[PDB]
């Protein structure tokens, strides 16, 4: 941007807080820096929402991020008996068919039995190769996230506060927020460690950051 728009920039990073939050009418973070005319613009991983767009002017988005959930991916009619014995081809001594039709259907049924065994083995192999998408939850609209107290089994989800995700959840789902606040977490790396060791089940955070963390994870 500096090359194209032909401007020179003075770069610094804010220590007043996280990306942005309004505490008692006073903004903090990069949003506070831009809003109070202490900086001309902010370049970090800053999310666009209605609350921030009301006070400042956002540019066009240059990478798509929503909110996402990360998990740890933790002598005729009695021939049926002989026919079924040959289905498992156990060579059970019972009798001997003598007719041409008898021999033909015996051979056809032996061929059918062997191909049925082969198809079963192949089907099991193909099923084992395929990887089922074993997902803990369908998404946020899931019943677990909404009312964990109203359901007997508990499960743990949390986020990093003072972010866009916390504001979104506060505005939308109040019971979910009240359950999530007591399970609050400090950092993204701390949340990943907690997910790895099992202290937490689901981590709700930014889509791009979680995608990058999943991509470069050790152990996949």
């Amino acid at each position: 941007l500096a090359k194209v728009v032909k401007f020179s920039y003075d770069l610094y990073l804010v220590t007043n807080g996280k990306h942005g939050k309004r505490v008692r009418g006073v903004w903090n973070g990069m949003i506070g820096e831009v809003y109070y005319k202490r900086a001309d613009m902010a370049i970090g991983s800053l999310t666009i929402n209605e609350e921030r767009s009301e006070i400042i002017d956002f540019s066009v988005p240059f990478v798509e991020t929503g909110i996402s959930v990360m998990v740890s991916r933790s002598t005729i009619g009695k021939s049926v008996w002989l026919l079924w014995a040959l289905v498992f081809n156990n060579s059970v001594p019972i009798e001997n068919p003598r007719g041409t039709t008898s021999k033909i259907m015996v051979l056809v049924w032996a061929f059918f039995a062997v191909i049925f065994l082969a198809s079963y083995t192949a089907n099991l192999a193909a099923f084992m190769i395929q990887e089922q998408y074993i997902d803990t939850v369908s998404g946020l609209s899931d019943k677990k996230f909404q009312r964990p107290q109203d359901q007997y089994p508990p499960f743990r989800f949390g986020t990093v506060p003072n972010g866009s995700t916390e504001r979104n959840i506060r505005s939308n789902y109040r019971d979910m927020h009240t359950h999530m606040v007591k399970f609050n977490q400090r950092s993204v790396e701390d949340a990943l460690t907690s997910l790895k060791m099992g202290k937490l089940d689901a981590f709700i955070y930014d889509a791009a950051v979680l995608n990058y963390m999943a991509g470069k994870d050790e152990g996949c």
Binding site: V60, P61, N89, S91, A110, V114, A118, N123, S171, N172
Partner: protein, 373 residues
Amino acid sequence: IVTIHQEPFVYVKPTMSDGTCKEEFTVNGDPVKKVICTGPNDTSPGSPRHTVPQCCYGFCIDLLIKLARTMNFTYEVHLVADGKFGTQERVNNSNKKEWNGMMGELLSGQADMIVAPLTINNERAQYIEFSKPFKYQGLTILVKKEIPRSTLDSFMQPFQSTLWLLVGLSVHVVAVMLYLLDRFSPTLSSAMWFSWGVLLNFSARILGMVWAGFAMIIVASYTANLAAFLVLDRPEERITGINDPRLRNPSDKFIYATVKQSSVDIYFRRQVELSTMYRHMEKHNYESAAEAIQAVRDNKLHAFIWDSAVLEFEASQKCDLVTTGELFFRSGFGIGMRKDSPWKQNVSLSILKSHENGFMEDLDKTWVRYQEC
């Protein structure tokens, strides 16, 4: 308001008697909100240009109704005269360049807002101002499922390379030699039964052992070939994404195209390394997305390059069509307006608010995520 006929977003249907359509209901019981749109008839080049009031409904119409509810204004919806979104085209008078389609109608004052799946890009943004994107999606390729279909019950095992005739000749020779050996050795029915059942039941023993081993290894190879076939073998000549040699190395045997005077056309024109694709596509670029989709269904086409939000919906509706999972040039659908205008900030804020809550998710469920398979 000016808009265009795009099936997932703007359905356009004829009226029943006078400025009214059948009051449909969604499967969830919520009535469908339809609006009256005055637009031209089906055929543009070969039919007279007389406007008729049809009725439009869909994703974009619901979004427009929500906008009018939030930002207090009334609307008068009409369709764009030609089925073109809008590009900067050379006019054969004065050697100038001008905008056509919805872009031209908006810039000329014929409309005050473009509520349609209008792609945001730098070419259009230099003359009009977009809102924050109300959709995120890229370009993708629409194809079909196999030439006609997949095989049902795997043709009872394709027996790839059966060489079955030679195998049967070998078993016939072995059976004949077995009968000869048994007759020489110190029993037609017994030998025939043994020859058939040897697969499952001095020299006769060793012959039995070698025959059992050979049939055993044959059945092992047969099981292995079936398993390999039904674990991996399934694509037969797929144009996997845009990186396939069929599209990378163009030929008249394989035909792919896009919609003329659209965003994809100028996207392919702008790029330098896709000039071969642009030349191969410009010959037979279609007038509208529906015509190209029908041509794909009728085999006049072989691949269609278009926005993912439309092609995925069409693949969901039509089971005989499919789309590759690839994506390129991810972009967004926003709402076009003129230069600095009073509605711009509130339109952007309303779209952001709808994104924050589930309204856009509700629209996706109602119009895009409702599939039949």
